[PDB]
Amino acid sequence: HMSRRSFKNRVLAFFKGYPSFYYPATLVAPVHSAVTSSIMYKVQFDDATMSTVNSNQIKRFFLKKGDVVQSTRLGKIKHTVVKTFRSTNEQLSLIAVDALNNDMVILAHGEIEVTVPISTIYVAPVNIRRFQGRDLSFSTLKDMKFEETS
Amino acid sequence: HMSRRSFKNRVLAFFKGYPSFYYPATLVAPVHSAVTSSIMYKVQFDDATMSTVNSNQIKRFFLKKGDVVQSTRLGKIKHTVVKTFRSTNEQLSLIAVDALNNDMVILAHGEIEVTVPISTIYVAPVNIRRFQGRDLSFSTLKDMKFEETS
Amino acid sequence: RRSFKNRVLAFFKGYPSFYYPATLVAPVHSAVTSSIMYKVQFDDATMSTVNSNQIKRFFLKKGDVVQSTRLGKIKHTVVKTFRSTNEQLSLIAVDALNNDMVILAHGEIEVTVPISTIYVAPVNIRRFQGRDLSFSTLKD
Amino acid sequence: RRSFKNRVLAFFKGYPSFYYPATLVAPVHSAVTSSIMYKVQFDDATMSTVNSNQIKRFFLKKGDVVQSTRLGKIKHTVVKTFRSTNEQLSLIAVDALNNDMVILAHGEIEVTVPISTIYVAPVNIRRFQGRDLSFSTLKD
Amino acid sequence: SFKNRVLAFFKGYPSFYYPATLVAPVHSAVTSSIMYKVQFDDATMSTVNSNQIKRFFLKKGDVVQSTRLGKIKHTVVKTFRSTNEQLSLIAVDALNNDMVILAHGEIEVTVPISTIYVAPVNIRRFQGRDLSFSTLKDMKFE
Amino acid sequence: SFKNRVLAFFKGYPSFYYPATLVAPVHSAVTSSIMYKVQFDDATMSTVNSNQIKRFFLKKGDVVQSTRLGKIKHTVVKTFRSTNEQLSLIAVDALNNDMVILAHGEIEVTVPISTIYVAPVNIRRFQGRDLSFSTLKDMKFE
């Protein structure tokens, strides 16, 4: 694993290592930092890597028409989002969906459209600054990790 | 953390490292081994160490009158269990309780009794062979870890 | 699916995390990285994907230390591999050679096992020399 | 609770896992082991318990690299510690010395901070020499 | 306004100059330098020293980026107005242009001018894009 | 029975000799040696080669352990019957004793004889505790 949360916990989280992009992850838990006051977030990437990010480094994983994104299957070519949808009625795994339980996204580059899995999305931080209405909602919430000894 | 299961998941699990005793742990998940057919168990010790054990290396954490055990606060002196109980009505953490949500145990050495926290128990494998009625029950059950990539 | 030439030994991310026989389904490129990854299929419990550091071509050589699901958890040394039949075998029965069957030593008993029962501890695969990936392909 | 002489810097098992000021409440012995552990109380978010490898006596020396919650995430070098008042201070304000207050350099600004705002990266505490545990006690 | 469009340094991550509207000069409590309140196009507000603000207009040859393009080198070919229709403030530069052509090698591409952003190093090369004269004369605390 | 009480090697973990009742001789499909079906006091069944089974009786000086005691050295002082009451089979040794005194240095302690277990190395020192003569004469497959 790969830990085990509702699809509504899917985020795009800033990957702090070194290619710097936002990637799909699961919001795992709020973090109280011993050393700073802002609230923070433990997040898990789809390769199961775990990371703690601030509130400026995390968005709900939902995509709107006109969002500029990239996809892992189309190189570094920037696309705009046309529409996200769910391709199936079967149970899908957490790494396959976004925060609304979609599965697939249609992307445009020009007026050339391609349909790609939503799990393949990644986002440049400059593109993320224009995502409006994508902050974590109150209804996302949630337990502190039961810290061992400390 | 320290992961986040009902108290009914509390076990005494064989610690495979090197003092060999059974210690209090939480049953985390069943494990399918790629390489052997018996069912196996991911278990977490109270210091948050994680381990995978077979069905011969795990008991429900409940204690019966006459069980021979040791306690972390009484050195290596073997005691028999007199009675387990819950000292409080407040929410207690997982590492503080056994499988019935007790908290405290009374231990005898001779007819000298001492009251000690149940989390302090540990058990010699030779003593564990005489625990009857302590195997995992069907009602304990339970999800496979959502394995990342594999 | 693939030619026998795509058979690999790949790090398994479940339990226990050893190297197991798989088929290299497709290399995976960039720019999520720069780096090459490999999409790997196990004989079966899974599609794959694995590091450049987590994969070898499936061919055993005299001296390799391996284990077999037929033989407990005792490590055994490879004597040789051979082909036991001119019948057509599934991909899953075969290494990268197209050998099925391997002879394994351990202290003068030599036992012969089907090549698909093989797995290799990470420590033992670190000492493998002839067996790094390339190619060009196949569909490798 | 304890004398100022029990003030330690202890590995914190929450986030982030640095060394923070604490009070050594009690040593813990055996036979769950053989080994000595230490029960440690932080200034406050917790009772403790910690390794022999995860604890130092709380006294800073010229040259120590540390950080302070007053001063961002910039590491600063210790100039000295001193006592700023003859009034009675809580245990939590004080190191193992009974000094409150530390002078911290960073490139010619020397800023003075309350000793309780101090924390030390594990890498920097690895380079601390005068400061290993002992005693006998106290209630250390 | 339109004449109040500027390129302003963003202190947060990532740190580039972005299109903004100049809101007011600001007398700051912690510094004695004159500061500039700007509103960025995501509508977040920020002030801004005088080393961190230019008039928003581009000249052929400027090294700039677009949010629509990847991070390879681009240079300004020309700016212009793509419509006579009446555009929002946040669509235009300080000359009321909304569209720029950028080049990389022999490839050219049109991007909306609002989509532009500039590395401080290349901003330092800009000649003639300080505030004002009018912007200066006309300002204006609160 | 009582005469059917033996100390039998446990193949599982941990591997000591424990009290058991001899159930039957066994002709084994995979070996040609005679084997012994024993039932251990936790009531699990096991068979057992002839190198893995003794008559259950102790002599002063034997090096043995008790499930009631820690794993420091203990030696048998004496065995005996602690009651005239009629005891279960699993409470007794092959001589119908239920109680043993063990020593470590100048400390002695009574433990129930059913509680005893023996390291193979110390079992190898036991003289005179092979099965039978009667146990042998009287056996008995199925």
PDB file of C-alpha atoms in Angstrom, chain A:
ATOM      1  CA  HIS A   1       0.000   0.000   0.000  1.00  0.00           C
ATOM      2  CA  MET A   2      -1.042   2.889  -0.681  1.00  0.00           C
ATOM      3  CA  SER A   3      -3.391   4.146   1.855  1.00  0.00           C
ATOM      4  CA  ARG A   4      -6.855   3.959   1.948  1.00  0.00           C
ATOM      5  CA  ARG A   5      -8.976   7.153   1.851  1.00  0.00           C
ATOM      6  CA  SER A   6     -12.135   8.305  -0.023  1.00  0.00           C
ATOM      7  CA  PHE A   7     -11.670   9.573  -3.645  1.00  0.00           C
ATOM      8  CA  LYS A   8     -12.702  13.007  -2.284  1.00  0.00           C
ATOM      9  CA  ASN A   9      -9.167  13.065  -0.685  1.00  0.00           C
ATOM     10  CA  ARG A  10      -7.526  13.203  -4.147  1.00  0.00           C
ATOM     11  CA  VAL A  11      -5.335  16.295  -4.576  1.00  0.00           C
ATOM     12  CA  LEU A  12      -2.730  17.778  -6.839  1.00  0.00           C
ATOM     13  CA  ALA A  13       0.176  18.278  -4.492  1.00  0.00           C
ATOM     14  CA  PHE A  14       3.481  20.082  -5.131  1.00  0.00           C
ATOM     15  CA  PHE A  15       6.313  17.612  -5.484  1.00  0.00           C
ATOM     16  CA  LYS A  16       9.192  19.146  -3.518  1.00  0.00           C
ATOM     17  CA  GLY A  17      11.901  16.958  -5.124  1.00  0.00           C
ATOM     18  CA  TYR A  18      13.544  17.749  -8.416  1.00  0.00           C
ATOM     19  CA  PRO A  19      11.564  17.973 -11.379  1.00  0.00           C
ATOM     20  CA  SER A  20       9.104  20.480  -9.664  1.00  0.00           C
ATOM     21  CA  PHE A  21       5.505  19.861 -10.720  1.00  0.00           C
ATOM     22  CA  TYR A  22       2.108  19.261  -9.067  1.00  0.00           C
ATOM     23  CA  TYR A  23       1.123  15.621  -9.240  1.00  0.00           C
ATOM     24  CA  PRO A  24      -1.970  13.505  -8.312  1.00  0.00           C
ATOM     25  CA  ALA A  25      -1.815  12.366  -4.667  1.00  0.00           C
ATOM     26  CA  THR A  26      -4.085  11.378  -1.792  1.00  0.00           C
ATOM     27  CA  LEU A  27      -4.529  13.717   1.203  1.00  0.00           C
ATOM     28  CA  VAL A  28      -3.607  11.383   4.065  1.00  0.00           C
ATOM     29  CA  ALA A  29      -3.835  13.585   7.200  1.00  0.00           C
ATOM     30  CA  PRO A  30      -3.456  17.156   8.557  1.00  0.00           C
ATOM     31  CA  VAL A  31      -0.089  17.768  10.213  1.00  0.00           C
ATOM     32  CA  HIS A  32       0.643  19.980  13.219  1.00  0.00           C
ATOM     33  CA  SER A  33       4.242  21.162  12.742  1.00  0.00           C
ATOM     34  CA  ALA A  34       6.234  21.548  16.020  1.00  0.00           C
ATOM     35  CA  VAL A  35       8.101  24.457  14.523  1.00  0.00           C
ATOM     36  CA  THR A  36       5.646  26.552  12.383  1.00  0.00           C
ATOM     37  CA  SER A  37       2.081  27.655  12.908  1.00  0.00           C
ATOM     38  CA  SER A  38       0.459  27.178   9.472  1.00  0.00           C
ATOM     39  CA  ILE A  39      -1.568  23.973   9.053  1.00  0.00           C
ATOM     40  CA  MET A  40       0.156  21.290   6.930  1.00  0.00           C
ATOM     41  CA  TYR A  41      -0.728  18.154   4.959  1.00  0.00           C
ATOM     42  CA  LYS A  42       0.558  14.726   4.673  1.00  0.00           C
ATOM     43  CA  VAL A  43       0.029  13.627   1.093  1.00  0.00           C
ATOM     44  CA  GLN A  44       0.826  10.351  -0.781  1.00  0.00           C
ATOM     45  CA  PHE A  45       1.905  10.267  -4.478  1.00  0.00           C
ATOM     46  CA  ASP A  46       0.766   7.447  -6.779  1.00  0.00           C
ATOM     47  CA  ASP A  47       4.169   5.680  -6.406  1.00  0.00           C
ATOM     48  CA  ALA A  48       3.375   5.624  -2.626  1.00  0.00           C
ATOM     49  CA  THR A  49       5.938   8.322  -1.742  1.00  0.00           C
ATOM     50  CA  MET A  50       4.793  10.345   1.239  1.00  0.00           C
ATOM     51  CA  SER A  51       5.314  14.099   1.672  1.00  0.00           C
ATOM     52  CA  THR A  52       4.280  16.989   3.961  1.00  0.00           C
ATOM     53  CA  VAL A  53       3.296  20.258   2.186  1.00  0.00           C
ATOM     54  CA  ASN A  54       1.842  23.589   3.153  1.00  0.00           C
ATOM     55  CA  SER A  55      -1.626  24.966   2.235  1.00  0.00           C
ATOM     56  CA  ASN A  56       0.008  26.798  -0.668  1.00  0.00           C
ATOM     57  CA  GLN A  57       1.235  23.523  -2.130  1.00  0.00           C
ATOM     58  CA  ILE A  58      -2.026  21.609  -2.527  1.00  0.00           C
ATOM     59  CA  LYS A  59      -5.255  21.793  -4.559  1.00  0.00           C
ATOM     60  CA  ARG A  60      -8.347  19.574  -4.803  1.00  0.00           C
ATOM     61  CA  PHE A  61      -7.845  17.258  -7.860  1.00  0.00           C
ATOM     62  CA  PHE A  62     -10.488  18.699 -10.046  1.00  0.00           C
ATOM     63  CA  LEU A  63     -10.067  20.017 -13.488  1.00  0.00           C
ATOM     64  CA  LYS A  64     -12.029  22.641 -15.269  1.00  0.00           C
ATOM     65  CA  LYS A  65     -12.423  23.376 -18.914  1.00  0.00           C
ATOM     66  CA  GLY A  66      -9.560  25.645 -20.080  1.00  0.00           C
ATOM     67  CA  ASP A  67      -7.088  24.507 -17.343  1.00  0.00           C
ATOM     68  CA  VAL A  68      -3.628  24.233 -18.825  1.00  0.00           C
ATOM     69  CA  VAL A  69      -2.036  20.900 -17.902  1.00  0.00           C
ATOM     70  CA  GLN A  70       0.429  18.284 -19.132  1.00  0.00           C
ATOM     71  CA  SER A  71       0.124  14.538 -19.417  1.00  0.00           C
ATOM     72  CA  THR A  72       2.724  11.867 -18.937  1.00  0.00           C
ATOM     73  CA  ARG A  73       1.744  10.231 -22.306  1.00  0.00           C
ATOM     74  CA  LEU A  74       2.115  13.432 -24.392  1.00  0.00           C
ATOM     75  CA  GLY A  75       5.669  14.521 -23.431  1.00  0.00           C
ATOM     76  CA  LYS A  76       5.955  18.166 -22.278  1.00  0.00           C
ATOM     77  CA  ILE A  77       3.269  19.469 -24.657  1.00  0.00           C
ATOM     78  CA  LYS A  78       0.865  21.710 -22.804  1.00  0.00           C
ATOM     79  CA  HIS A  79      -2.870  21.054 -23.352  1.00  0.00           C
ATOM     80  CA  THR A  80      -6.111  22.597 -22.140  1.00  0.00           C
ATOM     81  CA  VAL A  81      -8.729  20.563 -20.419  1.00  0.00           C
ATOM     82  CA  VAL A  82     -11.820  19.889 -22.433  1.00  0.00           C
ATOM     83  CA  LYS A  83     -13.852  17.571 -20.111  1.00  0.00           C
ATOM     84  CA  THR A  84     -13.324  14.932 -17.422  1.00  0.00           C
ATOM     85  CA  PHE A  85     -15.583  11.893 -17.179  1.00  0.00           C
ATOM     86  CA  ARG A  86     -15.944   8.439 -15.637  1.00  0.00           C
ATOM     87  CA  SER A  87     -15.456   5.667 -18.233  1.00  0.00           C
ATOM     88  CA  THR A  88     -16.828   2.855 -16.166  1.00  0.00           C
ATOM     89  CA  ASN A  89     -19.084   1.799 -13.419  1.00  0.00           C
ATOM     90  CA  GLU A  90     -16.661  -0.729 -11.862  1.00  0.00           C
ATOM     91  CA  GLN A  91     -14.680   0.004  -8.677  1.00  0.00           C
ATOM     92  CA  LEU A  92     -11.510   1.815  -9.628  1.00  0.00           C
ATOM     93  CA  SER A  93      -8.465   2.201  -7.514  1.00  0.00           C
ATOM     94  CA  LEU A  94      -7.547   5.519  -5.834  1.00  0.00           C
ATOM     95  CA  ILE A  95      -4.561   6.232  -8.140  1.00  0.00           C
ATOM     96  CA  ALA A  96      -6.940   6.002 -11.215  1.00  0.00           C
ATOM     97  CA  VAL A  97      -9.427   8.789 -10.144  1.00  0.00           C
ATOM     98  CA  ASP A  98      -9.585  12.497  -9.194  1.00  0.00           C
ATOM     99  CA  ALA A  99     -11.649  14.147  -6.439  1.00  0.00           C
ATOM    100  CA  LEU A 100     -14.964  13.634  -8.239  1.00  0.00           C
ATOM    101  CA  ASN A 101     -14.271   9.986  -9.091  1.00  0.00           C
ATOM    102  CA  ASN A 102     -13.464  10.667 -12.739  1.00  0.00           C
ATOM    103  CA  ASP A 103     -11.154   8.504 -14.561  1.00  0.00           C
ATOM    104  CA  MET A 104     -10.547  10.047 -18.004  1.00  0.00           C
ATOM    105  CA  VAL A 105      -9.760  13.447 -19.313  1.00  0.00           C
ATOM    106  CA  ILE A 106     -10.014  14.958 -22.788  1.00  0.00           C
ATOM    107  CA  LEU A 107      -7.130  17.407 -23.583  1.00  0.00           C
ATOM    108  CA  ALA A 108      -6.769  19.877 -26.516  1.00  0.00           C
ATOM    109  CA  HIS A 109      -3.729  21.281 -28.191  1.00  0.00           C
ATOM    110  CA  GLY A 110      -5.101  23.558 -30.682  1.00  0.00           C
ATOM    111  CA  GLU A 111      -8.265  21.913 -31.649  1.00  0.00           C
ATOM    112  CA  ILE A 112      -6.654  18.498 -31.684  1.00  0.00           C
ATOM    113  CA  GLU A 113      -8.196  16.459 -28.849  1.00  0.00           C
ATOM    114  CA  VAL A 114      -6.856  13.359 -27.171  1.00  0.00           C
ATOM    115  CA  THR A 115      -8.461  11.278 -24.446  1.00  0.00           C
ATOM    116  CA  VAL A 116      -6.083  10.241 -21.642  1.00  0.00           C
ATOM    117  CA  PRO A 117      -6.314   8.720 -18.103  1.00  0.00           C
ATOM    118  CA  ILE A 118      -6.718  11.444 -15.427  1.00  0.00           C
ATOM    119  CA  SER A 119      -3.841   9.686 -13.392  1.00  0.00           C
ATOM    120  CA  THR A 120      -1.398  10.809 -16.169  1.00  0.00           C
ATOM    121  CA  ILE A 121      -1.957  14.549 -15.414  1.00  0.00           C
ATOM    122  CA  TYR A 122       0.723  16.768 -13.987  1.00  0.00           C
ATOM    123  CA  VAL A 123       0.791  20.516 -13.661  1.00  0.00           C
ATOM    124  CA  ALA A 124       3.297  23.278 -13.816  1.00  0.00           C
ATOM    125  CA  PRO A 125       3.256  25.498 -10.759  1.00  0.00           C
ATOM    126  CA  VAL A 126       2.785  28.591 -13.103  1.00  0.00           C
ATOM    127  CA  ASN A 127      -0.332  26.951 -14.428  1.00  0.00           C
ATOM    128  CA  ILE A 128      -1.587  26.053 -10.980  1.00  0.00           C
ATOM    129  CA  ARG A 129      -1.589  29.750  -9.918  1.00  0.00           C
ATOM    130  CA  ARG A 130      -4.557  30.226 -12.169  1.00  0.00           C
ATOM    131  CA  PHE A 131      -6.693  27.394 -10.856  1.00  0.00           C
ATOM    132  CA  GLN A 132      -9.588  29.228  -9.160  1.00  0.00           C
ATOM    133  CA  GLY A 133     -12.041  27.383  -6.908  1.00  0.00           C
ATOM    134  CA  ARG A 134      -9.568  24.466  -6.344  1.00  0.00           C
ATOM    135  CA  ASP A 135      -8.601  24.897  -2.727  1.00  0.00           C
ATOM    136  CA  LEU A 136      -9.423  22.112  -0.234  1.00  0.00           C
ATOM    137  CA  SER A 137     -13.004  22.260   0.952  1.00  0.00           C
ATOM    138  CA  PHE A 138     -14.196  22.028   4.596  1.00  0.00           C
ATOM    139  CA  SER A 139     -16.011  18.732   3.803  1.00  0.00           C
ATOM    140  CA  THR A 140     -12.489  17.234   3.242  1.00  0.00           C
ATOM    141  CA  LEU A 141     -11.673  16.314   7.054  1.00  0.00           C
ATOM    142  CA  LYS A 142      -9.941  14.030   8.653  1.00  0.00           C
ATOM    143  CA  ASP A 143      -7.572  12.711  11.373  1.00  0.00           C
ATOM    144  CA  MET A 144      -4.072  13.544  12.722  1.00  0.00           C
ATOM    145  CA  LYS A 145      -1.600  10.584  12.431  1.00  0.00           C
ATOM    146  CA  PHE A 146      -1.544   8.779  15.913  1.00  0.00           C
ATOM    147  CA  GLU A 147       2.040   9.575  16.563  1.00  0.00           C
ATOM    148  CA  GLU A 148       4.125   6.767  18.076  1.00  0.00           C
ATOM    149  CA  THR A 149       5.737   7.795  21.464  1.00  0.00           C
ATOM    150  CA  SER A 150       5.855  11.549  20.640  1.00  0.00           C
TER     151      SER A 150
END
